[PDB]
């Protein structure tokens, strides 16, 4: 699932 | 639309090894795949089009093969630099889809934390809270355990954890953990604790400090 | 070089526009055309739409209605309107560019816009100072840093002394606190012997609220 916060898969 | 399957959604691999990514279409698509990176707080960034024809200014490493329903993107050796998600685009059929990314971990040694602690800034409590943060850098595997202590008072379910993203250059993580009180509870109170506790240390640390 | 520069991040309200403009250089409009692309936490990556060459557009089957390409040549600019957004329409925006005219190989990337949308205000954040001291040194070597406060929406750039320093820079992830703001902080580590003699500074910018504050970090 996507984070906007760090542009990663989390 | 055609579904894009990535497998698995983890990798984990050492530096050095050979590491491969699956991208499956829901029907086939011929050789019209493209593939992407993308680092932690990064744009995607084009590595591989139509399977396996490079792309000016990619390293070596990377290469694409597969067509019809089954792709493969391979890093032949992996570095550090590879931390990242990994996405393949269809468009074979309109509209171009994504399919959802797999990501890249990096193994290496137990790295032990370096622990340091800051109480709240005097500018800081002229606003009435108070902010202690705890910071624990350079250290792997991810897990630790944060505690808080206040006066041998037991913090619980007031601080907050935050994890960077896997280092590019040494493939450790870092991470902060930030108690958050009142000015008035904070001048109340005389010894800040924070006790963590990794892999790499033989015994909990703990760093503390006496208000004034 | 090739550059595609996308308009600051911003806040939208539920049921209102998304505005972004992409700005290019290094080639014209009139040769290339531009793409949208978002990525959610819902859906990942996903193709929005395209205005080409000759300013033909084309729109992604959910966005017909709701997505609006337009573009002026001669200022190599290009304009993305979405209108009537759900939260769940929260998700970065990017403007990209194929390698030939025609097709859908995106070699570059504007930066990506975060997009929020939320009823909430826009708050700049306030800067504390995570002062060096002996309880944050461990073998000639010091850590410090800065506390980003009680922002919304995100995002916040931190760097160091205007972009000199980045060696031993740590910028944690946001986290959303009780409140609905966010806070997080940016940390260094070095040598404390230079403690006395180097200035160091967080430069914080929070775009939204046209917050910018230059944070001296001494020890007490």
């Known amino acids: 699932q996507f984070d906007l916060s760090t542009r990663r898969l989390k | 639309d055609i579904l894009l399957t990535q497998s698995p959604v983890i990798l984990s691999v050492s530096p050095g090894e050979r590491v491969s990514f699956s991208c499956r279409a829901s029907?086939?698509?011929?050789?019209?795949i493209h593939w992407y990176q993308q680092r932690t707080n990064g744009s995607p960034r084009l590595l591989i089009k139509?399977?396996?024809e490079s792309i000016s200014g990619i390293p070596s490493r990377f290469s694409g093969s597969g067509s019809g329903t089954d792709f493969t993107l391979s890093i032949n050796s992996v570095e550090s630099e590879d931390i990242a998600d990994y996405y393949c685009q269809q468009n074979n059929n309109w509209p171009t889809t994504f399919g959802a990314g797999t990501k890249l971990e990096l193994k290496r040694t137990v790295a032990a934390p370096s622990v340091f602690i800051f109480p709240p800034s005097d500018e800081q409590l002229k606003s009435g809270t108070a902010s202690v943060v705890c910071l624990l850098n350079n250290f792997y595997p991810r897990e630790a355990k944060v505690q808080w202590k206040v006066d041998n008072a037991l913090q619980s379910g007031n601080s907050q954890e935050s994890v960077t993203e896997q280092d590019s250059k040494d493939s450790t993580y870092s991470l902060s953990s930030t108690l958050t009180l009142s000015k008035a509870d904070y001048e109340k109170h005389k010894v800040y604790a924070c006790e963590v506790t990794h892999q790499g240390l033989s015994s909990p640390v703990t760093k503390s400090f006496n208000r004034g | 070089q090739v550059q595609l520069k996308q308009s600051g991040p911003g806040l939208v309200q539920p049921s209102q526009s998304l505005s972004i403009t992409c700005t290019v250089s290094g080639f014209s409009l009139t040769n290339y055309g531009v793409h949208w692309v978002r990525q959610s936490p819902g859906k990942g990556l996903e193709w929005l739409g395209v205005?080409?060459?000759?300013?033909?557009?084309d729109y992604n089957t959910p966005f017909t209605s709701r997505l609006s390409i337009n573009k002026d040549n001669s200022k190599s600019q290009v304009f993305f309107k979405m209108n009537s957004l759900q939260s769940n329409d929260t998700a970065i925006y990017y403007c990209?560019?194929?390698?030939?005219?025609?097709?859908?190989?995106?070699?570059?990337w504007g930066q990506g816009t975060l997009v929020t949308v939320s009823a909430a205000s826009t708050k700049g954040p306030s800067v504390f100072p995570l002062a060096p001291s002996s309880k944050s040194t461990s073998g000639g070597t010091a850590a410090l840093g800065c506390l980003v406060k009680d922002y919304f929406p995100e995002p916040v750039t931190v760097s160091w002394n205007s972009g000199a320093l980045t060696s031993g820079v740590h910028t944690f992830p946001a986290v959303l606190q009780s409140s609905g703001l966010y806070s997080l902080s940016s940390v260094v580590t070095v040598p404390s012997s230079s403690l006395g003699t180097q200035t160091y500074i967080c430069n914080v910018n929070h775009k939204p609220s046209n917050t910018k504050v230059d944070k001296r970090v001494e020890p007490k």
């Open positions: 029907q086939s698509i011929g050789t019209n």
């Open positions: 205005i080409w060459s000759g300013g033909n557009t």
């Open positions: 139509y399977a396996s």
């Open positions: 990209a560019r194929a390698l030939t005219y025609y097709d859908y190989e995106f070699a570059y």
